[PDB]
Amino acid sequence: CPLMVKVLDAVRGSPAINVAVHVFRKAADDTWEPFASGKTSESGELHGLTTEEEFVEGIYKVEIDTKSYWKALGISPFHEHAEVVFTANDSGPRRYTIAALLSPYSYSTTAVVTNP
Amino acid sequence: CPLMVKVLDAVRGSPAINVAVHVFRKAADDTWEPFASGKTSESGELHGLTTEEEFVEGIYKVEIDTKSYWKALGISPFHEHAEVVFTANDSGPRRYTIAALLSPYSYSTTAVVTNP
Amino acid sequence: CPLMVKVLDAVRGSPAINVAVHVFRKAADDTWEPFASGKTSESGELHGLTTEEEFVEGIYKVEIDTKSYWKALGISPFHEHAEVVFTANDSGPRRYTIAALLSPYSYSTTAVVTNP
Amino acid sequence: CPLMVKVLDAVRGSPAINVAVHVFRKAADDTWEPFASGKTSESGELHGLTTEEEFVEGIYKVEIDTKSYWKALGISPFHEHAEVVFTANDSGPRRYTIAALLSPYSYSTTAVVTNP
């Protein structure tokens, strides 16, 4: 898995389940092209977004729909979504884990990058 | 001062000085129009971005140029920038503090919303 | 003011008000002796803990009673309290800001060390 | 595994490897008794600290030696260690993951608690 997303809920101390995630890649004409999408599983993870062959050098954006997650729990949150933007694979193929920790008025995001 | 930004450096335990910040407002055509910008001061803060008159309800994006900050320190960072997207809502008098805590592979952002 | 504490609530996007803080200094017998204490103000800050005269080099512990704070809101929390342990070192003039960002199952703490 | 610890490095974007961890349990006489210890693996994880039979109700402290980790990388950090203190199993047996994200002047810690 070259790209995996993991989302945790800091209010409940649990994985964040059924969170929508959209990934985009910056195209030649400086616009964001849809690349992949999915929802987190019961473990708060999203696997299988892409393959090593498809995941070429580029600037990518991972957008996590945090607002819908909190609203479904009855909480009105601050952010519209969480976005993570990064250059990938520019010194060769790597594996990327993007982790997000969510609270209604705060989030953090961390990347773990490994060389296969 | 209804909107202020504070940026901290988690590697050095210091304010993040001279970081570029751009603020955008979402226009009816669903694109981002420039709204305000500046560089953080010696205390890592950016004040005087807008006034109560101009800061109407709407969707705002705050973009922090984190990549330039780490590159000046000689540290290779993960993210292209840090983006915070939120709705401003009239619901009594509101002041918004957007704080960001920066590491090379991780950031957190928190909103503090108070009423004078 | 060489030592100050700031506490934020990530669930409500507000200062964490009326939180008990205790400060201890490590004594030569390797036990913790009380040093200073207080409750955070309306802005979530605690000032006036000590003076430059008394704040000598040594190992200090700052204990934040997070559990009582969440229990007052009716939220069941994970941690018994939040503890920050550090060495104060004379190395030019130093002011220490210890910040904590609280969620029910997660906290972060950051030190900002500046020189007037 | 009733108790697992995972440690990440926010400066390098990698797991934090060979980090010493000590766990204690509060004894009848209000002192901290040693319970288990170990070091994180190449994946930044520490498994096998305890069993369900041994992991009874109590107040536990997980101490992570962050200072030694940073010093070995040539960085002088702020904190002496990171401590996580919590009541475990008081409403029946659960599984606990304690995660820590480390920077030299900041850390965060999150608990994920599941019902087996």
Residue numbers in the entry:
A (entry chain A), B (entry chain B), C (entry chain B), D (entry chain A): 10 to 125
What is written in the article reporting this PDB entry?
Human transthyretin (TTR) is a 55 kDa homotetramer that transports thyroxine and retinol-binding protein in the blood and cerebrospinal fluid. Wild-type TTR is inherently amyloidogenic and can lead to senile systemic amyloidosis (SSA). Native human TTR is known to be a homotetramer, or, more precisely, a dimer of dimers. The monomer consists of two four-stranded β-sheets, arranged in a sandwich-like tertiary structure in which β-strands HGAD are opposed to β-strands FEBC.
